[PDB]
Swiss-Prot record:
GO terms for molecular function: chromatin DNA binding; damaged DNA binding; histone demethylase activity; histone H3K9 demethylase activity; histone H3K9me2/H3K9me3 demethylase activity; metal ion binding. It is found in: Nucleus. The chain holds residues 11 to 341 of 523 of the full protein. Its cofactor is Fe(2+). Its main location: nucleus. Belongs to the JHDM3 histone demethylase family. GO terms for biological process: cellular response to ionizing radiation; chromatin remodeling; double-strand break repair via homologous recombination; inflammatory response; positive regulation of chromatin binding; positive regulation of double-strand break repair via nonhomologous end joining; regulation of gene expression; regulation of protein phosphorylation. This is Lysine-specific demethylase 4D. Transmembrane segments: none annotated. Residues 136-302 form the JmjC domain. It comes from Homo sapiens (Human). The modification PolyADP-ribosyl glutamic acid is found at E16, E17.
Length: 331
């Protein structure tokens, strides 16, 4: 069995190996990469996502989210307070202001310490989930707006033809902006490219151990657990590495830098934070190996998780017994 300790693997494809996306995912899985729940892919030196970022300040963040925390430093939830629209140029200047900028620090480890010590005491503003792409249309390799769609994968594997579309999303971050513990919708893969700016630190639980994380989350967030049997779908709960280690939960951590891709694998719980002003692009995708995870994915039916148009068909075809209850939650 490859990668039995479920370590995060780092790949360096050649320009030739970067041509065929599906083939390279299958290669990484041949080497056991999926066991970690997360992999890093460093693009060949010849590749570029686009020529420059000199022209992005006019992108609109229609609904910036202020991430307000409640709890204790290692175990907290966050709620998203909607703020007035602002441009990416306006947001970058806010990120760089004295109130929001990254503090002086020695290295990534010191900055991680400061994040877990002090996150709850601030409310950073996140530009999340903005439909769009920063890949040049002429970038042919690993262009997140030109991937095979999840609807097409389901049709190729299962024969069924369904509505829905699959497009990328932009994330503009600042110091302390936070992504809560979650798996993807329908336990899909994700791919995330850090276009520019400061790093993103990731934490991940191996898929084979995901239920250990869920059981701890039920203990740590007991009212949330009574409210919903899949409350991590709400994407609001944080648990620190110190707390995870105290409770014996297997996990790993890695820092993504600008120019690097991360892949999350089906049912790989992940969480993390941004080091400073940055911009990432991410999209969900599927492979044949996903289908069995899609069929078993938990679902939020309490009404909180509220998701995309395209998830309807995935529930309806893969989980027909759950469809009626889940759709009541959506409506
Ligand atoms: O970058 C972020 O804020 C969060 N992204 C992801 O959870 C992802 O790519 O799967
Ligand atoms: Mg612009
Ligand atoms: Ni994710
Ligand atoms: Zn719920």
């Amino acid at each position: 069995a490859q990668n039995p300790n479920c370590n995060i693997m780092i790949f360096h494809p050649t320009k030739e190996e970067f041509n065929d996306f599906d083939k390279y995912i299958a290669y990484m899985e041949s080497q056991g990469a999926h066991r970690a729940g997360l992999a890093k892919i460093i693009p060949p030196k010849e590749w570029k996502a686009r020529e420059t970022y000199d022209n992005i300040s006019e992108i609109l963040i229609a609904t910036p989210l202020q991430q307000v925390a409640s709890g204790r430093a290692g175990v907290f939830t966050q709620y998203h307070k909607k703020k007035k629209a602002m441009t990416v140029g306006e947001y970058r200047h806010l990120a760089n202001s004295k109130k929001y900028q990254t503090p002086p620090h020695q290295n990534f480890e010191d900055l991680e310490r400061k994040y877990w010590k002090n996150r709850i005491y601030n409310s950073p503003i996140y530009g999340a989930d903005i439909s769009g792409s920063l890949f040049d249309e002429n970038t042919k390799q690993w262009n997140l707006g030109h991937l095979g769609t999840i609807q097409d994968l389901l049709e190729k594997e299962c024969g069924v033809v369904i509505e829905g579309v699959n497009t990328p999303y932009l994330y503009f971050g600042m110091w302390k902006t936070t992504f809560a513990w979650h798996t993807e919708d329908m336990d899909l893969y994700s791919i995330n490219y850090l276009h520019l700016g400061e790093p993103k630190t990731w934490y991940v639980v191996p898929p084979e151990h995901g239920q250990r994380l869920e059981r701890l989350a039920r203990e740590l967030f007991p009212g949330s657990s009574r409210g919903c049997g899949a409350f991590l779908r709400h994407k609001v709960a944080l648990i620190s590495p110190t707390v995870l280690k105290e409770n014996g939960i297997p996990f790993n951590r890695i820092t993504q830098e600008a120019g690097e891709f991360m892949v999350t694998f089906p049912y790989g719980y992940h969480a993390g934070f941004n080091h400073g002003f940055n911009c990432a692009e991410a999209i969900n995708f599927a492979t044949p190996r996903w289908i069995d995870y899609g069929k078993m994915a938990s679902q939020c039916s309490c009404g909180e998780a509220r998701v995309t148009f395209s998830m309807d068909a995935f529930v309806r075809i893969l989980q027909p017994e759950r469809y009626d209850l889940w759709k009541r939650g959506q409506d």
